[PDB]
Amino acid sequence: DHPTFNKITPNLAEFAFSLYRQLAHQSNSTNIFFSPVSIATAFAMLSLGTKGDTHDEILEGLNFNLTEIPEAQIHEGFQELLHTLNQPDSQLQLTTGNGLFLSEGLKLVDKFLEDVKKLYHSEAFTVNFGDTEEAKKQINDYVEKGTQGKIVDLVKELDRDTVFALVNYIFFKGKWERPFEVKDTEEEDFHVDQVTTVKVPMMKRLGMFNIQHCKKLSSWVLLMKYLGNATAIFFLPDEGKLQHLENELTHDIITKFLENEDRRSASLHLPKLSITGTYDLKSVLGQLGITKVFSNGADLSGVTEEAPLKLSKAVHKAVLTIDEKGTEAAGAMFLEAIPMSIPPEVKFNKPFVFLMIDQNTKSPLFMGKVVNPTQK
Numbered sequence: 232d233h234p235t236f237n238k239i240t241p242n243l244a245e246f247a248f249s250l251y252r253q254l255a256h257q258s259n260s261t262n263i264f265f266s267p268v269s270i271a272t273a274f275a276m277l278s279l280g281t282k283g284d285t286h287d288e289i290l291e292g293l294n295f296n297l298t299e300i301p302e303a304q305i306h307e308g309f310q311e312l313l314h315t316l317n318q319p320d321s322q323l324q325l326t327t328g329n330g331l332f333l334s335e336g337l338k339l340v341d342k343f344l345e346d347v348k349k350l351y352h353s354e355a356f357t358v359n360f361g362d363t364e365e366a367k368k369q370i371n372d373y374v375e376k377g378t379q380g381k382i383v384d385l386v387k388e389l390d391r392d393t394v395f396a397l398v399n400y401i402f403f404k405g406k407w408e409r410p411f412e413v414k415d416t417e418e419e420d421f422h423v424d425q426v427t428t429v430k431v432p433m434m435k436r437l438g439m440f441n442i443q444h445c446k447k448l449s450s451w452v453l454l455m456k457y458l459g460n461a462t463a464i465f466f467l468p469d470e471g472k473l474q475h476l477e478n479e480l481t482h483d484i485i486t487k488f489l490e491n492e493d494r495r496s497a498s499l500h501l502p503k504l505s506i507t508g509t510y511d512l513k514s515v516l517g518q519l520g521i522t523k524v525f526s527n528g529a530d531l532s533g534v535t536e537e538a539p540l541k542l543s544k545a546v547h548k549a550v551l552t553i554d555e556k557g558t559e560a561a562g563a564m565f566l567e568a569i570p571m572s573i574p575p576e577v578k579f580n581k582p583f584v585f586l587m588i589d590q591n592t593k594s595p596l597f598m599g600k601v602v603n604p605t606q607k
């Protein structure tokens with residue numbers, strides 16, 4: 232009977248897909264990119280300072296069923312996971328932070344201040360929202376320092392009555408276990424749709440890949456490993472099957488693709504790009520059923536005993552960069568031969584979906600859809 236993160240990873244997966252479809256329904260002409268694990272962890276942390284329905288609503292909102300699993304194990308699970316995710320010091324640049332900002336006019340509960348800081352290794356600051364421009368600068372300064380300037384001016388303006396603000400961000404850049412030759416990267420066409428074309432740098436390599444064409448999903452399924460036990464899963468939907476692919480993704484199916492270990496020879500064309508997702512959590516989580524904590528009825532007596540408090544603003548920003556880089560230090564020479572037959576062509580020159588997974592812990596680090604590679 233030891234604390235484990237094994238129990239919640241399945242639900243994190245379901246949460247990834249729930250949020251994804253919600254966003255995919257709102258618009259289908261825009262890129263989608265977010266971190267399931269980051270968002271879930273922040274709110275799992277927040278819940279510790281809430282009580283009653285407000286509390287039960289947050290967890291249910293993250294796809295948990297309080298009868299299916301004990302409340303105590305949900306919290307321990309996120310604590311373990313965080314200690315595993317919050318320090319994968321291999322050569323996978325993964326910086327992620329949680330920053331809480333509360334008005335100086337509130338008497339805060341110690342216990343809460345200690346959990347966020349010692350257990351969840353997150354930040355809790357007091358600020359004077361009386362001076363909006365000053366408060367704003369403090370929030371942005373924090374995120375800029377944490378991302379090393381990789382993320383600036385996240386907040387544009389604070390509301391007059393802002394009393395509690397949450398900021399979650401994450402940045403990622405990996406190294407392929409098997410690099411692409413920078414030389415082969417050439418400018419090709421990316422077909423946004425029948426009449427829209429975008430010029431983009433296309434990486435490419437002919438080789439053996441863990442690739443398979445799933446008839447259930449009507450799509451090509453490609454897995455590529457990063458150094459640091461992180462696995463990228465790309466999905467290239469057949470003509471007119473983007474929606475079917477989106478509606479059919481479930482955690483059970485992902486678990487299966489990861490069992491395939493057979494390789495195949497293919498010509499792969501993958502765009503070189505950088506995408507970012509920026510979302511107003513109050514707006515998106517509200518649709519998923521998480522509303523109380525953002526309302527006047529909120530029960531945050533775990534944060535401040537008697538004062539009427541509510542989460543005024545919550546933002547999430549995710550940034551990912553993908554290129555041909557792999558094993559640094561010099562060109563570790565690989566071997567490339569000529570096929571006996573013409574291998575299949577798998578070009579990601581049209582809208583596609585991808586998912587990033589920590590092979591170790593099996594948690595969904597990222598999920599997204601690229602409709603336009605230059606809409607970064």
Ligand SMILES: [Zn+2]
Nearest residue numbers: 278279302306
């Ligand atoms: Zn609880």
Ligand SMILES: [Zn+2]
Nearest residue numbers: 314349350352
């Ligand atoms: Zn710790």
Ligand SMILES: [Zn+2]
Nearest residue numbers: 363364388389
């Ligand atoms: Zn202003």
Ligand SMILES: [Zn+2]
Nearest residue numbers: 474475476478
């Ligand atoms: Zn379908």
Ligand SMILES: [Zn+2]
Nearest residue numbers: 498499500576
């Ligand atoms: Zn080719």
